[PDB]
Amino acid sequence: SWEVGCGAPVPLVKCDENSPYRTITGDCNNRRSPALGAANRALARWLPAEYEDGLALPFGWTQRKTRNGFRVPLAREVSNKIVGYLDEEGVLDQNRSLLFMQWGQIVDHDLDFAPETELGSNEHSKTQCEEYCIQGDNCFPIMFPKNDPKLKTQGKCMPFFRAGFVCPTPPYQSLAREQINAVTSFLDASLVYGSEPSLASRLRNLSSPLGLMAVNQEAWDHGLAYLPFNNKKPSPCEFINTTARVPCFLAGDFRASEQILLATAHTLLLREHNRLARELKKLNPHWNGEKLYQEARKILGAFIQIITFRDYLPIVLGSEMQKWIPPYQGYNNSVDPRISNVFTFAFRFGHMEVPSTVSRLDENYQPWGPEAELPLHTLFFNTWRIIKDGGIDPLVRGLLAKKSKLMNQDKMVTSELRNKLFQPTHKIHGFDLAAINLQRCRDHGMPGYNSWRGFCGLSQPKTLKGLQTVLKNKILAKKLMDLYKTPDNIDIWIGGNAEPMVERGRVGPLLACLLGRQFQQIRDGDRFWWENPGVFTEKQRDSLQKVSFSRLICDNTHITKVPLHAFQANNYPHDFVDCSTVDKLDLSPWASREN
Numbered sequence: 228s229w230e231v232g233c234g235a236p237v238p239l240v241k242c243d244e245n246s247p248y249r250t251i252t253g254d255c256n257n258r259r260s261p262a263l264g265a266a267n268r269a270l271a272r273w274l275p276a277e278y279e280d281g282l283a284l285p286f287g288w289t290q291r292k293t294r295n296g297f298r299v300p301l302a303r304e305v306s307n308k309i310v311g312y313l314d315e316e317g318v319l320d321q322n323r324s325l326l327f328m329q330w331g332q333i334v335d336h337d338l339d340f341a342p343e344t345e346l347g348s349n350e351h352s353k354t355q356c357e358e359y360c361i362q363g364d365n366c367f368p369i370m371f372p373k374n375d376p377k378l379k380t381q382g383k384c385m386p387f388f389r390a391g392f393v394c395p396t397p398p399y400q401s402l403a404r405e406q407i408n409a410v411t412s413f414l415d416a417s418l419v420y421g422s423e424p425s426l427a428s429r430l431r432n433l434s435s436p437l438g439l440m441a442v443n444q445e446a447w448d449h450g451l452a453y454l455p456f457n458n459k460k461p462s463p464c465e466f467i468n469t470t471a472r473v474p475c476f477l478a479g480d481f482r483a484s485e486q487i488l489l490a491t492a493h494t495l496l497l498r499e500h501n502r503l504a505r506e507l508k509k510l511n512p513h514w515n516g517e518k519l520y521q522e523a524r525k526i527l528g529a530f531i532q533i534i535t536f537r538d539y540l541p542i543v544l545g546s547e548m549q550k551w552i553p554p555y556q557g558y559n560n561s562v563d564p565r566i567s568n569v570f571t572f573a574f575r576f577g578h579m580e581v582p583s584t585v586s587r588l589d590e591n592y593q594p595w596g597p598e599a600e601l602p603l604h605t606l607f608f609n610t611w612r613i614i615k616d617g618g619i620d621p622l623v624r625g626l627l628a629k630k631s632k633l634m635n636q637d638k639m640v641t642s643e644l645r646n647k648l649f650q651p652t653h654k655i656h657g658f659d660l661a662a663i664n665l666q667r668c669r670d671h672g673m674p675g676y677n678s679w680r681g682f683c684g685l686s687q688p689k690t691l692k693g694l695q696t697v698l699k700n701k702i703l704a705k706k707l708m709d710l711y712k713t714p715d716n717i718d719i720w721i722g723g724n725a726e727p728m729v730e731r732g733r734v735g736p737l738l739a740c741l742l743g744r745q746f747q748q749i750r751d752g753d754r755f756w757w758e759n760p761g762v763f764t765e766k767q768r769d770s771l772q773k774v775s776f777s778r779l780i781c782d783n784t785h786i787t788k789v790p791l792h793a794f795q796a797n798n799y800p801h802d803f804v805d806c807s808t809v810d811k812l813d814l815s816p817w818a819s820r821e822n
């Protein structure tokens with residue numbers, strides 16, 4: 228007897244239904260189906276979940292339970308044998324700036340977050356999990372395979388805690404397990420403003436009727452603002468350097484300080500808000516704080532949607548853009564906003580675009596200081612390098628002048644992420660993002676590689692030879708078969724990323740399809756999509772079609788030399804122009820007048 232729906236977390240909201248602005252939680256976007264796309268609800272399922280016991284257990288959880296007749300290789304084993312590489316020479320992307328990779332994480336953070344199980348309120352089950360590699364309940368450690376170097380130095384496994392699921396955080400069983408999406412599915416700047424009420428209201432500066440976002444009161448960037456500091460027992464950022472004592476930042480999204488270039492882009496967007504809110508007071512001295520806040524917030528979301536859809540997607544996707552994301556024909560309330568569960572893994576193609584180093588550049592876009600270039604892995608949860616070493620201006624230049632890493636079937640994920648990842652409660656710079664991606668692929672009950680090739684109307688290889696043909700790599704196909712034994716068993720993250728990139732894109736056909744369908748949905752299914760008639764006026768959409776990431780930098784930094792097209796590889800000074808040459812955002816259409 229099928230069910231209409233599940234009822235634990237949700238004190239329900241009324242909906243204004245006259246309302247102009249999006250809610251903070253995403254609720255009320257779809258009038259006939261309120262909760263669609265709202266934070267803290269189940270990630271949507273495009274295909275039924277596939278677990279080892281049909282309900283919630285991990286393929287690979289029980290030694291004896293095979294997937295289609297074969298054991299399901301250890302995540303860290305797939306990582307070692309396939310994902311890793313030694314030589315960082317030549318892996319750079321000749322036609323994608325480092326911003327390409329960065330916007331990707333930004334957009335991704337705007338769309339989805341599946342935390343680990345809230346059941347962690349003064350327990351040792353985390354330390355027991357950590358210490359003796361005892362699998363049980365939500366502790367699902369990543370076991371090291373034999374001959375794994377980390378055995379000589381780290382122990383027998385790597386922490387890992389299953390994702391939050393719906394209708395509790397403790398006991399459940401009776402139907403298939405569904406993981407939670409803690410942020411709104413809409414492209415709406417929830418990473419800047421937040422997805423709950425605590426949080427939004429508290430990022431805000433309410434002492435002054437100007438609708439500013441609260442800023443750091445304890446540090447300045449040559450007169451420019453920094454996000455406020457955070458508040459936890461264990462701040463990660465402090466932990467990585469106990470002498471410096473610099474806290475992580477407080478943003479609408481939780482992960483803001485995971486890495487220094489992500490905190491940088493966050494710092495960037497928070498300035499755009501206050502800049503808009505300030506130019507909005509100058510233009511409208513009567514508008515109160517909430518009106519300034521909400522209309523700045525409106526505009527910021529529109530900027531994110533445009534840079535993403537106009538500049539970003541066309542070059543992830545390439546020749547498949549026009550197959551999945553056609554010209555926008557208007558708000559369609561029949562579409563499902565919801566970020567699917569598989570998309571949260573598909574969008575992880577970004578992990579293969581992160582290079583091994585990050586640079587600080589000075590005004591002439593030459594090395595800044597004596598330790599200009601830094602090992603990626605020393606910048607996890609690193610805020611001190613920003614506050615007490617130059618601000619964001621040198622880092623933003625590197626985002627423009629340096630390049631992204633290029634996905635390469637023989638060099639997938641840099642060791643800075645594959646062996647040196649820092650996670651916020653554990654002590655070492657010794658984790659593996661690729662192994663975690665795979666373990667999480669199964670924690671979430673993802674169907675295999677062929678289930679998705681089928682979903683996308685693509686062939687489903689059954690033999691080495693077939694897979695060779697699809698991967699266009701004999702040796703990669705070989706290692707996969709040796710590891711998984713049937714194309715059927717290949718985890719979607721790695722199978723999806725094993726495919727050669729499409730014409731003029733950076734993902735293969737399978738991911739082009741998975742990503743292409745989702746972005747089409749979050750656009751068409753948004754009542755507040757910026758280009759939907761009503762949302763913005765006649766002259767309002769005209770001023771907005773002029774925004775660019777180059778202008779965002781120009782207005783929120785003291786940089787004055789930027790590329791016109793920030794996402795392609797840009798070389799200084801030839802590919803760089805002066806800020807005066809770049810179109811500004813004309814706020815004149817926001818003018819309401821009265822008597």
Ligand code: HEM
Pocket residue numbers: 328329330331332335339340341342485486570571572574575576577578580581607660663664667
């Ligand atoms: C450090 C990390 C990064 C940079 C140095 C980084 C970068 C990205 C980019 C460039 C992405 C897409 C364009 C992207 C996507 C998603 N990530 Fe990733 N990422 C770093 C680290 C992490 C870690 C840690 C996680 C959590 C892993 C887990 O399963 O526990 C992570 C996840 C994701 C993810 C799913 C988010 C969610 O929906 O839960 C992406 C879409 N990344 N990252």
Ligand SMILES: *[C@@H]1O[C@H](CO)[C@@H](O[C@@H]2O[C@H](CO)[C@@H](O[C@@H]3O[C@H](CO)[C@@H](O)[C@H](O)[C@@H]3O)[C@H](O)[C@H]2NC(C)=O)[C@H](O)[C@H]1NC(C)=O
Pocket residue numbers: 432434435439440441442443444
């Ligand atoms: C919320 O908004 C208020 C008002 O904008 C913020 O206070 C204002 O902050 C500015 C810059 O931080 C201050 O300007 C200058 O202060 C320095 C040193 O304190 C001084 O040398 C100058 O005289 C100059 O005024 C200013 O004091 C202050 N303005 C007012 C009217 O109070 C406040 O910081 C914001 N709160 C948060 C949490 O962001």
Ligand SMILES: *[C@@H]1O[C@H](CO)[C@@H](O[C@@H]2O[C@H](CO)[C@@H](O[C@H]3O[C@H](CO)[C@@H](O)[C@H](O)[C@@H]3O)[C@H](O)[C@H]2NC(C)=O)[C@H](O)[C@H]1NC(C)=O
Pocket residue numbers: 322541542731792795
């Ligand atoms: C480096 O990458 C550049 C971006 O991927 C690429 O330039 C792009 O060329 C394509 C091919 O005509 C154009 O495609 C876009 O055309 C217009 C946009 O002007 C849109 O209406 C279409 O939907 C489509 O997205 C672009 O004009 C152009 N990209 C940009 C941002 O201008 C270069 O060819 C690459 N450089 C090298 C040396 O290979």
Ligand SMILES: *[C@@H]1O[C@H](CO)[C@@H](O[C@@H]2O[C@H](CO)[C@@H](O[C@H]3O[C@H](CO)[C@@H](O)[C@H](O)[C@@H]3O)[C@H](O)[C@H]2NC(C)=O)[C@H](O)[C@H]1NC(C)=O
Pocket residue numbers: 467468470471472611615616
């Ligand atoms: C933890 O953070 C420390 C900062 O709180 C950092 O120490 C600082 O490192 C800088 C280099 O970035 C040193 O400054 C350099 O340049 C200045 C120029 O004025 C010179 O005075 C110095 O001789 C030096 O060449 C600072 O000396 C130093 N500051 C302090 C208070 O020690 C640590 O390196 C960080 N440790 C880790 C593990 O990240």
Ligand SMILES: *[C@@H]1O[C@H](CO)[C@@H](O[C@H]2O[C@H](CO)[C@@H](O)[C@H](O)[C@H]2NC(C)=O)[C@H](O)[C@H]1NC(C)=O
Pocket residue numbers: 559560561562563
């Ligand atoms: C709004 O969105 C829906 C998607 O849910 C679109 O739907 C359709 O396209 C076909 C028209 O050629 C219809 O025959 C199908 O019923 C439908 N397909 C799917 C997957 O829904 C369509 O653009 C809009 N729907 C309506 C009713 O206008």
Ligand SMILES: [Ca+2]
Pocket residue numbers: 337338410411412413414415416417418
């Ligand atoms: Ca969102």
